[PDB]
Paper text:
Among these applications, antitumor treatment with therapeutic antibodies is primarily based on antibody-dependent cellular cytotoxicity (ADCC), which is promoted through interaction between the Fc region of immunoglobulin G1 (IgG1) and Fcγ receptor IIIa (FcγRIIIa) on the surface of immune effector cells, such as natural killers and macrophages. The Fc region of IgG1 possesses one conserved N-glycosylation site (Asn297) in each CH2 domain, where a bi-antennary complex-type oligosaccharide is expressed with microheterogenities resulting from the presence or absence of non-reducing terminal fucose, galactose, and sialic acid residues. Namely, removal of the core fucose residue from Fc glycans causes dramatic enhancement of ADCC through improved IgG1-FcγRIIIa interaction. Crystallographic studies have indicated that binding of IgG1-Fc to FcγRIIIa is mediated not only by protein-protein interactions but also by carbohydrate-protein and carbohydrate-carbohydrate interactions.
For crystallization, we used a soluble form of FcγRIIIa (sFcγRIIIa), which consisted of the extracellular domains and possessed two N-linked oligosaccharides at Asn45 and Asn162, while the remaining three N-glycosylation sites were mutationally eliminated. In this crystal structure, electron density of the Asn162 glycan was again largely unobservable. In this context, the results of our MD simulations indicate that core fucosylation of Fc glycan also intramolecularly perturbs the amino acid residues in close spatial proximity, as best exemplified by Tyr296, which neighbors the N-glycosylation site in Fc chain A. The aromatic ring of Tyr296 of nonfucosylated IgG1-Fc is sandwiched between the Asn162 glycan and the Lys128 side chain of sFcγRIIIa. In the presence of the IgG1-Fc core fucose, this major conformational state is significantly less populated, giving rise to divergent minor conformational states, which are exemplified by χ1 dihedral angle of −55° and also by direct contact with the fucose residue in Fc chain A glycan. In the crystal structures of the IgG1-Fc/ sFcγRIIIa complexes, clarity of electron density of the sFcγRIIIa Asn162 glycan depended on the presence or absence of the core fucose residue of the IgG1-Fc glycans. Our REMD simulations successfully extrapolated this missing information, revealing that the Asn162 glycan is stabilized in solution mainly through carbohydrate-carbohydrate interaction with the nonfucosylated form of Fc glycan, which, however, is sterically hindered by the core fucose of Fc.
Author numbering:
A (entry chain C): 10 to 30, 42 to 52, 56 to 73, 76 to 174
B (entry chain B), C (entry chain A): 230 to 444
């Protein structure tokens, strides 16, 4: 039940690799798993077996220019928050802003991950990213982050 | 050489011409234009919607090579005069293999209380009468929306030697413009009547005329 | 023709106001604005060249934090009225660590033979005298380049409620425009005088005015 890369929210045409300790939406597979070029149909619930039957792990495939990836959306105070502003086909993204509650928070000339090393209650809000693919202004959807103790 | 086109094509959706929406004999068109179409993924698929309902009457134009090695690719939907003036939204949905999803674009007539244009003709200044041509002026003001058409005639024939300013936002939120017809002075001195013709939804029969001559 | 740039700061270079270049009581400025400066490389360097010859004396403002968490930095080069009119080029060279190579932007007065505006004031149309307010019109035509300033005055003070159209290209390659002054009808009939003032490089003392009143 391990995703490589870790991102559970992915985009169409993203490569995913899946590690075991398969059932797709509770159903059998082709092989005993590499998703070369994801589609919306590859979303849903995933479980593992060869050992016991594993817990349920969700893979959301999205459609868009940009997707705000993270390892989760609920964090403890002082935990590190890693955001990736992922572009479709890893198309070069420039003048990237990460926003919180409608205000630009961090700006980058070239696409870069926005790693907050030490979370606080001030970091609670809705986030999205945006940027330029060539001359085209594109934004990802929002995601709610909430910070607890 | 070729450009990179990283973001794929872009859509520009244009309205009908004011005069085409307002005269029943003419045919108003919404025009969806797609630019930055690459040579490698040149196909564009169009879906057209009127207030969300799909319509199939659109015309597909041959794609046009531009002087930067992209295609300009266009679809033209004729529309019903009354629908456009009643504020129906026209949606152009554009699909291309270089996009992650369809681009959708919408257009309707500007919203807000239509206001009737007031039309006023103004003879040349006395200081212009020394010149060989004179300027006859048509002031059109107090109108909303800005969509409007202005033309000149004399004695049942069109007068085409004119120029019209774009509409300008006035301080009460209405629009005004001026149109200037340039005529040979002899023609004005002879007592010929010139006429300013204005078309706008808020006018009666979408039409009005004011006239101007030597007094 | 030019291979497109990546991300980094961007530069916008702005000319002086026309009215500032023409009246010697005013001080005309060329303004060089750098946006999308990151916090990681916030240091920005302005070199300023007139026709090729570097100048100093440019007054650089301190970087201001923008709501989108980028820095914006402005440099303001004061310009000599006659240098602008004779058409000398002004060059902003912006240097910064995020830029692979410095960005250069150049501006100057539009080129071409200057042409003197003719100015004619036009009273309200007879049909308009029905209304509570009325329109005094100032027609300005035959000017080049399009750089111009137009104002309405009365009893030495600037009139409030007037709008001026953008410059329109007439068929001879010159420009015209119209300016509309709106006044209460009382003031017109009571017989006050209103002046339309025009500042353009090709007028004697870069100035002319034309009066307008009932008679
Ligand atoms: C590669 O090249 C191509 C081709 O380029 C060209 O060819 C070479 C030789 C060059 O000389 C080049 O300069 C030529 O243009 C490039 O293609 C261009 O790409 C740019 C974008 O990068 C497009 O720019 C947009 O233009 C819009 C206006 O377009 C019209 O006007 C221009 C002239 O000003 C014409 O050239 C255009 O063709 C358009 O003309 C109109 O066309 C309609 C359809 O034919 C006509 O309507 C129809 O008329 C017919 C009769 O013919 C019937 O009667 C029908 O009934 C009727 O439908 C219409 O009459 C005609 N008008 C004319 C001729 O005047 C701009 O509106 C737009 O600006 C908006 O978007 C910008 C975002 O990029 C933004 O910056 C602006 O702020 C603005 O944003 C909008 O603002 C308004 C309020 O102001 C808001 O309402 C909106 O919300 C807001 N946002 C929006 C909409 O997002 C663009 O500037 C350009 O049009 C396009 N050219 C062509 C020919 O299509 C290509 O980019 C190049 N690529 C590369 C990588 O280099
Ligand atoms: C982060 O935020 C910043 C700024 O934040 C802003 O504030 C917040 C709260 C929001 O409101 C936000 O939206 C605001 O922007 C963002 O910074 C902006 O970045 C964009 C680019 O991405 C810039 O857009 C360009 O704007 C030009 C016009 O700018 C003027 O007008 C706008 C309003 O339309 C104003 O907002 C600006 O401040 C500029 O205003 C002028 O300022 C001058 C300098 O002060 C004034 O002149 C001086 O006046 C004084 C008196 O006060 C003296 O008299 C001096 O003598 C005199 O010099 C002037 O009066 C004033 N004008 C006013 C008030 O109207 C556009 O020209 C430009 O478009 C060109 O370039 C585009 C390429 O990107 C291209 O696509 C266009 O087609 C167009 O093409 C060019 O055309 C020109 C000439 O026609 C030619 O040179 C070229 O052929 C051609 N191509 C070129 C040059 O490549 C853009 O639209 C925007 O200006 C900038 N804002 C500010 C405030 O700096 C930033 O983007 C954000 N970052 C991120 C990552 O999100
Ligand atoms: C494992 O389980 C998960 C979770 O349940 C599944 O995820 C679901 O997958 C669906 C498709 O595979 C998703 O559907 C998509 O999302 C839209 C939801 O808003 C939906 O509207 C779309 O559905 C299409 O099919 C319908 C016909 O039954 C249509 O009503 C709809 O419009 C779409 O069809 C197209 O419509 C246009 C209209 O213009 C036509 O022109 C086209 O011809 C139509 N067909 C095509 C092919 O384009 C949309 O596809 C669903 O949302 C998603 N749910 C979630 C929560 O993610 C996994 O798929 C599942 N995996 C497996 C292997 O079973
Ligand atoms: C993109 O669009 C938004 C929404 O209006 C705007 O604020 C932003 O500055 C634009 N450009 C970039 C590079 O984000
Ligand atoms: Cl400006």
């Amino acid at each position: 039940v391990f995703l490589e890369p870790q991102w559970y929210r992915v985009l169409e045409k993203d490569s995913v690799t899946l590690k075991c300790q398969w059932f797709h939406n509770e159903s059998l597979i082709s092989s005993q798993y590499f998703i070369d070029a994801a589609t919306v149909d590859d979303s849903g619930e995933y479980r593992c077996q060869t050992s016991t039957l594993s817990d349920p792990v969700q893979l959301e495939v999205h459609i868009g220019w940009l997707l705000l990836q993270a390892p989760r959306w609920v964090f403890k105070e002082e935990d590190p928050i890693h955001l990736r502003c992922h572009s479709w086909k890893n198309t070069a993204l420039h003048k990237v802003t990460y926003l919180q509650n409608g205000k630009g928070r961090k700006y980058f000339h070239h696409n870069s991950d926005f790693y907050i090393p030490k979370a606080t209650l001030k970091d609670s809000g809705s986030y999205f990213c945006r940027g330029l693919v060539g001359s085209k202004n594109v934004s990802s959807e929002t995601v709610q982050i909430t910070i607890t103790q | 050489p070729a450009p990179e086109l990283l973001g794929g094509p872009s859509v520009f959706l244009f309205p009908p011409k004011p005069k085409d929406t307002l005269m029943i004999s003419r045919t108003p068109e919404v025009t969806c234009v797609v630019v930055d179409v690459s040579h490698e993924d040149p196909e564009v698929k169009f879906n057209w919607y009127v207030d969300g309902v799909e319509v199939h009457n659109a015309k597909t134009k041959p794609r046009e090579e531009q002087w930067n090695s992209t295609y300009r690719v266009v679809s033209v939907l004729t529309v019903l005069h009354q629908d456009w003036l009643n504020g129906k939204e026209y949606k152009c949905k554009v699909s291309n293999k270089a996009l992650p999803a369809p681009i959708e674009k919408t257009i309707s007539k500007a919203k807000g209380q239509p206001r009737e244009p007031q039309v006023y003709t103004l003879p040349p200044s006395r200081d212009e009468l020394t010149k060989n041509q004179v300027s006859l002026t048509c002031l059109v003001k107090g109108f909303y929306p800005s969509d409007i058409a202005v033309e000149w005639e004399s004695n049942g024939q069109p007068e085409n030697n004119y120029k019209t300013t774009p509409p300008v936002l006035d301080s009460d939120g209405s629009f005004f413009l001026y149109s200037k017809l340039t005529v040979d002075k002899s023609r004005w001195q002879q007592g010929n009547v010139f006429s300013c013709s204005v078309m706008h939804e808020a006018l009666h029969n979408h039409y009005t005329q004011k006239s101007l001559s030597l007094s």
